[PDB]
Amino acid sequence: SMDHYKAKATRHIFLIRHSQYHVDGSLEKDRTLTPLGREQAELTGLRLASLGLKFNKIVHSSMTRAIETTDIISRHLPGVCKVSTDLLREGAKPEAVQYYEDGARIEAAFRNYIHRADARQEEDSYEIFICHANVIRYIVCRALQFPPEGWLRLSLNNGSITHLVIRPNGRVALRTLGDTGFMPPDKITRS
Amino acid sequence: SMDHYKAKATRHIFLIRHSQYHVDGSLEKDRTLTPLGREQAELTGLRLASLGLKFNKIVHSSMTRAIETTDIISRHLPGVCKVSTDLLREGAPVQYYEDGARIEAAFRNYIHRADARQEEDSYEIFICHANVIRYIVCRALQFPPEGWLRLSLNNGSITHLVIRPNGRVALRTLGDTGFMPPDKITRS
Ligand SMILES: [Cl-]
Ligand SMILES: [Cl-]
């Protein structure tokens, strides 16, 4: 649950991990989805469209993998606005500096997108965020008031759907985590 | 992760919540699956069988709703041994102290206990109720057990924990019913 949180209606937060991608592309623009990754994103779009929900917004990382996952999923959700954000990117001892930076960035995403309620919300909301495993796991554990170690102990599939429900008083329920039940096992990957 | 734990191989723990059942049934023998519940169990059985895994065991609650969910799922898993246990039974929706103690006992007997005989990676199914599944997840991951009620598990859902030999635990999915059509999904 969440301290100092007050929103006007319930929020349904769907956190989608980007699909399988070419980790070894030289430049960020080369780090596109794999053919399997494109099929994963089709399955995720099919699933989301099948829920009978009107989504308010798709917010997505500006990394190539997340833009492409979004391009595919959005075809299934005609009329839903898309917002690109650099805040949901991952940055380029190296390890410690990178973790320090990533910590700040994932907390920033939490505060900006999850803890921050919109004063202009007028009904229950259904919000899609397409991004990466660190920020998704972190948001889940942060929202549920789990320990700082905790997010590293989750492991989420490519194209997976995580559903958090946030009540106006800040009560949080995790309805599903890392759901790829809608994908055949021969399409399921972690990277 | 878990302290005082050394296993020989990795264990894949699949925690399945019983399907939808008749909550108002008078006696425990009347609290059977609803027709939709039988449908949910079939979907969960189909999903489990599709994973290409030879499951080592199916451990289930001795409650009617769990026995019935198991009956259906086991049809999809021929040859897999089944063990009934009262350790996974739930009490009513200060007797609650002993129900609490029993979920800890369950965690200890089934999850924290590794088999010295198991030298190969194992795949273990537990079919039981939302309270003990949520507790197990929190305990295995060293989350505040009071976190338990922040987790919501659909009927017939699959929750998957991975336990490495050194006791490191990963949560791979929680409350997965993505294999069920939306109109078949229930929480009670
Ligand atoms: Cl991303
Ligand atoms: Cl049960």
Author numbering:
A (entry chain B): 88 to 179, 191 to 289
B (entry chain A): 88 to 180, 195 to 289
From the paper:
Phosphoglycerate mutase family member 5 (PGAM5) is a mitochondrial membrane protein that belongs to the phosphoglycerate mutase (PGAM) branch of the histidine acid phosphatase superfamily, known also as two-histidine phosphatase (2H-phosphatase).
Among a series of truncated proteins, the ΔN90-PGAM5 construct harboring the catalytic domain readily crystallized, enabling high-resolution structure determination to 1.70 Å. The two molecules of PGAM5 in the crystallographic asymmetric unit demonstrated a dimeric arrangement. Both subunits associated by aligning the β-sheet cores along the non-crystallographic two-fold symmetry with their active sites located at distal sites. Intermolecular interactions were exclusively constrained to the C-terminal portions, where the α4-β5 loop, β6 strand, and C-terminal tail from one molecule packed against the corresponding region in the other protomer. Unlike the α4-β5 loop and β6 strand, the contribution of the C-terminal tails to dimeric intersubunit contacts was limited to only one hydrogen bond between the β6 D277 and the tail residue G279, prompting us to investigate the role of this region regarding the stability of the dimer. These results therefore suggested that the C-terminal tail played an important stabilizing role in the dimeric assembly, which was also supported by the dissociation constant (KD) of ∼0.48 μM determined for the construct “d” (residues 90–289) by AUC equilibrium sedimentation experiments. As expected, the catalytic domain alone (ΔN90) lacked an ability to form large assemblies, and existed as a dimer in solution even at high protein concentration.
